[PDB]
């Protein structure tokens, strides 16, 4: 099995238009949640969202190129280019067939579908854009990243709702472990702030209807009432260890475990007691070849829904036993909102940086303790601590449980 | 870990029949599944033909109340997955549920549901959007509903890679079992792309054939080919670790031995010059199988009936196989089924597996005018009875997604 290390990071999030800004805001407990501006909030019971601020795609590419990309693809291309530049990786003709791309999205180009369907209704099918299909489909983030980078290796796109970013990174990790690529540009992207996405997640009451941006996203709080929707992309460069060392790459950490399970229960409701999530964490722990007590910090899925936070806490207790009260847990969705398909990507970046910088980001907004959510959620303030192992969960709608384990890099 | 992986069950819905036996017997008899479009009114579109399911009434498989909560792409996936598990005679007992996973992809997911729910949003407002809209529309719902129906609690995912979807999904499921992470995987592809926006979109970028004659519309490798004919359905197989299949007395159709994945990194929709990416995917699959190229007896081509796919796929076969390119047999079953998009790789994996099990190569129908650039042996018009040892199946998808599988006769 090959060892796989993290050599580059790239991100766009409601906390900043690069990794450094996003991470610095996360470690200082800054909220990225504000009033909805992308759509007319009057039409929905949800009133807040976590949007990108001050993002001008034309700062990264020509207007003609950006006009042929839905926002989810624009975020993926920008974050992937940022990650490859951070990695100082030169994708030459010689290495191109060994550099792959595995970036997922939960929804793909929903904004493009909506605008093009309105054109179909008013102008007819003969006025639908020739670019409609490639712009909408979720695999276009990987497709456009591959063209932008000249990456000709293993190529895919995972679509698993909230688990998308975590599954994509895990799948890319497995490609490198088995020797099928030397480098993988991987993660998740999402631009879900659209009319249908707000209508859909309001119709099934998943979104918080709390109009106060100061308290809307409050994972583990007794008064939590649903998630706050966010947007962005989190992309990392995974690389085979010997390949990284030979080119003098900087190494942030090592990816060592990946677990994937299904609840086989319900289309949207998480399984009772978090049994599926517990099994995914146990599979990742076994994959890493460690004891559960070796985990220092869990970057929780922690979406601020009643059932997720309760069941994820139960799953942590099942897996860790007495150690559940010794490790630190935090939900960075308290600050970023739920980035859906990009959540696992941004959270893998925060998990990797927590190890590299020795800082645990906090869960903000816990004002009322919930007796069912009684672990150490690192409330309010970041904690400076040397970390050896970090576990990140994505317990997605539809029963998709995905877990990654990261380790401090040791020669 | 390198476990052997065998095929123990097949399930399908295609324009050639509502089960595997009917679809297979029609394919080996050169029966065309193409006719006039009935799903949408084709008067306003330039494409006039399609390959639809015949006499498929979902109420024959489930209650109307259950069907109403599933988009057609999920109905096809659940029906084909249940037929595959019944064919495999697999009882997912308690100790086996966490070792049985699902990896089924779709290129578009619930596009019909998205169009109808957005039209409701526009005309009636967001309160009329169904609470089931989001789960019904997302492509990962095929895996999600199959997992619930079967009680499969193991590794689960959904790949979305346009035309390569079904082939990537099976390859990825094969890798899960090969590395020891599941004992059984229910995998393949599903698609219900006969919708207003899909026809409008593939007409707008001229990918579809505008040929109104169903007798000649899909004619892969013919000099007069002019685009693909859209189809629908699902192709699902049961992959199983060998020792497990033997312990439960499973019937074995064949073995999956190689999988290759590459990216063209060229253009959003246009295939790379001379099929270079496709050649690299075939070479990666051959290398993965540990065989010489001369060991391939039959190639189930991607062969979509577009000018550039068929020309470049022929060039890629010559690059990989050299003189052996004129010795092996090649055929495109899309000459009969049309292009099933995300389900193409699933149905084509079933036809590749059955070609080995039954020792019959299905033909390419409708070649009336030889093309000097497409001069390989396309098994024209009539099926060929032949003992096969290795079969290669390609999916060279829009967006530069190249995927190849290699199947082997099981002793
Ligand atoms: Cl055409
Ligand atoms: K709510
Ligand atoms: K997480
Ligand atoms: K094929």
PDB file of C-alpha atoms in Angstrom, chain A residues 185-301:
ATOM      1  CA  UNK A 185      -6.830  16.883  -6.957  1.00  0.00           C
ATOM      2  CA  UNK A 186      -9.897  16.097  -4.875  1.00  0.00           C
ATOM      3  CA  UNK A 187     -12.697  17.462  -2.735  1.00  0.00           C
ATOM      4  CA  UNK A 188     -16.138  18.923  -3.124  1.00  0.00           C
ATOM      5  CA  UNK A 189     -17.898  21.973  -4.538  1.00  0.00           C
ATOM      6  CA  UNK A 190     -21.397  23.359  -4.213  1.00  0.00           C
ATOM      7  CA  UNK A 191     -23.397  26.423  -5.295  1.00  0.00           C
ATOM      8  CA  UNK A 192     -26.778  25.421  -3.778  1.00  0.00           C
ATOM      9  CA  UNK A 193     -28.149  28.896  -3.035  1.00  0.00           C
ATOM     10  CA  UNK A 194     -30.911  28.680  -5.623  1.00  0.00           C
ATOM     11  CA  UNK A 195     -34.693  28.968  -5.803  1.00  0.00           C
ATOM     12  CA  UNK A 196     -35.277  25.192  -5.968  1.00  0.00           C
ATOM     13  CA  UNK A 197     -32.721  24.292  -3.323  1.00  0.00           C
ATOM     14  CA  UNK A 198     -34.232  26.785  -0.825  1.00  0.00           C
ATOM     15  CA  UNK A 199     -37.768  25.643  -1.835  1.00  0.00           C
ATOM     16  CA  UNK A 200     -36.794  21.959  -1.448  1.00  0.00           C
ATOM     17  CA  UNK A 201     -35.016  22.161   1.914  1.00  0.00           C
ATOM     18  CA  UNK A 202     -37.787  24.453   3.263  1.00  0.00           C
ATOM     19  CA  UNK A 203     -40.498  21.984   2.033  1.00  0.00           C
ATOM     20  CA  UNK A 204     -39.006  19.155   4.115  1.00  0.00           C
ATOM     21  CA  UNK A 205     -38.237  21.530   7.051  1.00  0.00           C
ATOM     22  CA  UNK A 206     -34.488  20.696   7.000  1.00  0.00           C
ATOM     23  CA  UNK A 207     -33.464  24.372   7.056  1.00  0.00           C
ATOM     24  CA  UNK A 208     -33.452  26.487  10.204  1.00  0.00           C
ATOM     25  CA  UNK A 209     -36.255  29.120  10.111  1.00  0.00           C
ATOM     26  CA  UNK A 210     -34.389  31.185  12.751  1.00  0.00           C
ATOM     27  CA  UNK A 211     -34.118  34.748  11.243  1.00  0.00           C
ATOM     28  CA  UNK A 212     -31.284  35.737  13.621  1.00  0.00           C
ATOM     29  CA  UNK A 213     -27.856  35.166  11.946  1.00  0.00           C
ATOM     30  CA  UNK A 214     -26.234  35.298  15.410  1.00  0.00           C
ATOM     31  CA  UNK A 215     -28.013  32.082  16.589  1.00  0.00           C
ATOM     32  CA  UNK A 216     -29.266  30.291  13.471  1.00  0.00           C
ATOM     33  CA  UNK A 217     -26.459  27.688  13.188  1.00  0.00           C
ATOM     34  CA  UNK A 218     -25.921  26.343  16.705  1.00  0.00           C
ATOM     35  CA  UNK A 219     -24.800  22.674  16.547  1.00  0.00           C
ATOM     36  CA  UNK A 220     -25.405  20.709  19.779  1.00  0.00           C
ATOM     37  CA  UNK A 221     -27.463  23.581  21.287  1.00  0.00           C
ATOM     38  CA  UNK A 222     -30.778  22.589  22.904  1.00  0.00           C
ATOM     39  CA  UNK A 223     -32.591  25.143  20.673  1.00  0.00           C
ATOM     40  CA  UNK A 224     -31.099  24.062  17.309  1.00  0.00           C
ATOM     41  CA  UNK A 225     -33.803  23.762  14.603  1.00  0.00           C
ATOM     42  CA  UNK A 226     -32.127  22.885  11.318  1.00  0.00           C
ATOM     43  CA  UNK A 227     -29.157  23.631   9.127  1.00  0.00           C
ATOM     44  CA  UNK A 228     -28.052  26.938   7.546  1.00  0.00           C
ATOM     45  CA  UNK A 229     -27.193  26.506   3.845  1.00  0.00           C
ATOM     46  CA  UNK A 230     -23.754  27.544   2.600  1.00  0.00           C
ATOM     47  CA  UNK A 231     -21.684  27.507  -0.575  1.00  0.00           C
ATOM     48  CA  UNK A 232     -18.092  27.125  -1.680  1.00  0.00           C
ATOM     49  CA  UNK A 233     -15.445  24.545  -2.498  1.00  0.00           C
ATOM     50  CA  UNK A 234     -12.730  22.724  -0.575  1.00  0.00           C
ATOM     51  CA  UNK A 235     -10.059  21.018  -2.701  1.00  0.00           C
ATOM     52  CA  UNK A 236      -6.847  19.311  -1.653  1.00  0.00           C
ATOM     53  CA  UNK A 237      -3.909  17.776  -3.427  1.00  0.00           C
ATOM     54  CA  UNK A 238      -3.253  14.183  -2.327  1.00  0.00           C
ATOM     55  CA  UNK A 239       0.080  12.724  -3.343  1.00  0.00           C
ATOM     56  CA  UNK A 240       1.993   9.432  -3.089  1.00  0.00           C
ATOM     57  CA  UNK A 241       4.703   9.930  -0.411  1.00  0.00           C
ATOM     58  CA  UNK A 242       7.815   9.034  -2.445  1.00  0.00           C
ATOM     59  CA  UNK A 243       6.592  11.291  -5.315  1.00  0.00           C
ATOM     60  CA  UNK A 244       6.085  14.214  -2.822  1.00  0.00           C
ATOM     61  CA  UNK A 245       9.532  13.703  -1.192  1.00  0.00           C
ATOM     62  CA  UNK A 246      11.385  13.461  -4.559  1.00  0.00           C
ATOM     63  CA  UNK A 247      10.063  16.878  -5.758  1.00  0.00           C
ATOM     64  CA  UNK A 248      10.593  18.528  -2.324  1.00  0.00           C
ATOM     65  CA  UNK A 249       6.839  19.068  -1.733  1.00  0.00           C
ATOM     66  CA  UNK A 250       5.658  20.649   1.526  1.00  0.00           C
ATOM     67  CA  UNK A 251       3.563  18.160   3.525  1.00  0.00           C
ATOM     68  CA  UNK A 252       0.627  19.229   5.687  1.00  0.00           C
ATOM     69  CA  UNK A 253      -0.169  15.744   7.001  1.00  0.00           C
ATOM     70  CA  UNK A 254      -1.064  12.206   6.009  1.00  0.00           C
ATOM     71  CA  UNK A 255      -4.432  10.618   5.148  1.00  0.00           C
ATOM     72  CA  UNK A 256      -4.603   7.216   6.869  1.00  0.00           C
ATOM     73  CA  UNK A 257      -8.204   6.009   7.153  1.00  0.00           C
ATOM     74  CA  UNK A 258     -11.498   6.039   5.241  1.00  0.00           C
ATOM     75  CA  UNK A 259     -14.806   4.429   6.189  1.00  0.00           C
ATOM     76  CA  UNK A 260     -18.038   4.252   4.176  1.00  0.00           C
ATOM     77  CA  UNK A 261     -21.340   2.710   5.370  1.00  0.00           C
ATOM     78  CA  UNK A 262     -25.046   2.946   4.618  1.00  0.00           C
ATOM     79  CA  UNK A 263     -27.923   3.212   7.129  1.00  0.00           C
ATOM     80  CA  UNK A 264     -30.370   1.319   4.783  1.00  0.00           C
ATOM     81  CA  UNK A 265     -33.120   3.056   6.786  1.00  0.00           C
ATOM     82  CA  UNK A 266     -34.855   6.108   5.301  1.00  0.00           C
ATOM     83  CA  UNK A 267     -34.521   8.541   2.391  1.00  0.00           C
ATOM     84  CA  UNK A 268     -33.761  11.551   4.614  1.00  0.00           C
ATOM     85  CA  UNK A 269     -33.966  10.614   8.302  1.00  0.00           C
ATOM     86  CA  UNK A 270     -30.761   9.486  10.020  1.00  0.00           C
ATOM     87  CA  UNK A 271     -30.788   6.002  11.622  1.00  0.00           C
ATOM     88  CA  UNK A 272     -31.671   5.712  15.327  1.00  0.00           C
ATOM     89  CA  UNK A 273     -28.694   6.168  17.715  1.00  0.00           C
ATOM     90  CA  UNK A 274     -26.312   6.926  14.817  1.00  0.00           C
ATOM     91  CA  UNK A 275     -25.563   3.222  14.293  1.00  0.00           C
ATOM     92  CA  UNK A 276     -24.450   3.703  10.662  1.00  0.00           C
ATOM     93  CA  UNK A 277     -22.235   6.662  11.584  1.00  0.00           C
ATOM     94  CA  UNK A 278     -20.659   4.579  14.369  1.00  0.00           C
ATOM     95  CA  UNK A 279     -19.888   1.771  11.858  1.00  0.00           C
ATOM     96  CA  UNK A 280     -18.300   4.294   9.400  1.00  0.00           C
ATOM     97  CA  UNK A 281     -16.063   5.685  12.187  1.00  0.00           C
ATOM     98  CA  UNK A 282     -15.100   2.107  13.199  1.00  0.00           C
ATOM     99  CA  UNK A 283     -14.275   1.222   9.551  1.00  0.00           C
ATOM    100  CA  UNK A 284     -12.045   4.339   9.249  1.00  0.00           C
ATOM    101  CA  UNK A 285     -10.292   3.486  12.598  1.00  0.00           C
ATOM    102  CA  UNK A 286      -9.657  -0.114  11.419  1.00  0.00           C
ATOM    103  CA  UNK A 287      -8.426   1.186   8.013  1.00  0.00           C
ATOM    104  CA  UNK A 288      -5.931   3.474   9.887  1.00  0.00           C
ATOM    105  CA  UNK A 289      -4.771   0.513  12.047  1.00  0.00           C
ATOM    106  CA  UNK A 290      -5.166   2.529  15.286  1.00  0.00           C
ATOM    107  CA  UNK A 291      -6.960   2.204  18.620  1.00  0.00           C
ATOM    108  CA  UNK A 292      -9.991   4.582  19.052  1.00  0.00           C
ATOM    109  CA  UNK A 293      -8.124   6.290  21.973  1.00  0.00           C
ATOM    110  CA  UNK A 294      -5.566   7.632  19.441  1.00  0.00           C
ATOM    111  CA  UNK A 295      -8.144  10.135  18.054  1.00  0.00           C
ATOM    112  CA  UNK A 296      -7.526  13.583  19.560  1.00  0.00           C
ATOM    113  CA  UNK A 297     -10.159  15.622  17.754  1.00  0.00           C
ATOM    114  CA  UNK A 298     -13.318  14.971  15.783  1.00  0.00           C
ATOM    115  CA  UNK A 299     -14.469  17.542  13.223  1.00  0.00           C
ATOM    116  CA  UNK A 300     -18.145  16.578  13.525  1.00  0.00           C
ATOM    117  CA  UNK A 301     -20.700  16.541  10.750  1.00  0.00           C
TER     118      UNK A 301
END
